[PDB]
Amino acid sequence: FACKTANGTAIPIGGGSANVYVNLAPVVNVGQNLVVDLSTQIFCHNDYPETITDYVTLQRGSAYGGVLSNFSGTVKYSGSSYPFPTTSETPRVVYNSRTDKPWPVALYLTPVSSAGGVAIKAGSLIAVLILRQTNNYNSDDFQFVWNIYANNDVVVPT
Numbered sequence: 001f002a003c004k005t006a007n008g009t010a011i012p013i014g015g016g017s018a019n020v021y022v023n024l025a026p027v028v029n030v031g032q033n034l035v036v037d038l039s040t041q042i043f044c045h046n047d048y049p050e051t052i053t054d055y056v057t058l059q060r061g062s063a064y065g066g067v068l069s070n071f072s073g074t075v076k077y078s079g080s081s082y083p084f085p086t087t088s089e090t091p092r093v094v095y096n097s098r099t100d101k102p103w104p105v106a107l108y109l110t111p112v113s114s115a116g117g118v119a120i121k122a123g124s125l126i127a128v129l130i131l132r133q134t135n136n137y138n139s140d141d142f143q144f145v146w147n148i149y150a151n152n153d154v155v156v157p158t
């Protein structure tokens with residue numbers, strides 16, 4: 001079991017940590033959602049799917065910078081929505097193919113009020129999302145840590 005991002009960065013068998021830089025809506029009014037769709041950025045596969053089933057969870061989803069201070073909302077994982085920042089481990093998704101498949105995680109965030117200008121700075125840490133992978137085979141329990149950075153400024157206007 002291993003992962004990679006849309007920019008080609010791999011996290012190998014056994015886990016590790018990678019930086020993901022996300023493009024964001026440049027202007028988000030009060031009353032609008034900012035969506036951070038990591039399902040278009042992070043992909044994984046099962047290396048031996050004929051004999052092993054891999055189980056994958058969002059173990060923890062943490063908010064930083066302007067996302068922690070200027071926004072509020074939820075995380076959708078697979079077919080269900082949860083508080084973000086997270087207060088629990090999600091249920092398991094099955095990976096059962098060697099073709100990379102999306103990690104089905106998206107943040108749906110809304111402005112808590114206008115910041116007066118820049119609500120998320122370009123290059124700032126906005127989230128840390130921990131993917132936990134186990135299986136039905138041995139006692140592997142690996143963490144793939146995704147540090148999410150804003151690629152551009154997000155303004156919540158007055």
Ligand SMILES: CCCCO[C@H]1O[C@H](CO)[C@@H](O)[C@H](O)[C@@H]1O
Pocket residue numbers: 001002013014045046047048049052053054134135137140
């Ligand atoms: C004998 C299995 C060696 C490869 O083990 C790896 O591949 C399998 C299948 O993806 C995973 O379940 C496991 O955690 C490792 O990432």
